[PDB]
């Protein structure tokens, strides 16, 4: 329930950061976005495993 909603949010954030980092032309902006993305992907795995 609350976990499914959290999951949906992450997937979306994951899918949004992926696009944004790929298009980012500033190197600093890209590295930041790509870095936050690793985090989102990780959050998804964390959500899949606690239980």
Residues near Zn ion (CB under 5 A) are 10, 40, 43
Collapsed DSSP state (helix, strand, coil) of residue 1: coil
Are 44 and 10 a contacting pair, CB within 8 Å? yes
Smallest gap from Cβ 21 to a copy of itself, in A, equals 9
Q: Which does 45 bind (CB under 5 to 8 A by kind): a copy of itself, Zn ion, none?
A: none
Count of residues in contact with a copy of itself, rule CB under 8 A: 26
Are 47 and 7 a contacting pair, CB within 8 Å? yes
Smallest gap from Cβ 12 to a copy of itself, in A, equals 7
């Amino acid at each position: 329930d609350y976990l499914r909603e959290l999951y949906k949010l992450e997937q979306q954030a994951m899918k949004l950061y992926r696009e944004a980092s790929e298009k980012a032309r500033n190197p600093e902006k890209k590295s930041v976005l790509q870095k936050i993305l690793e985090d989102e992907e990780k959050h998804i795995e964390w959500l899949e495993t606690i239980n």
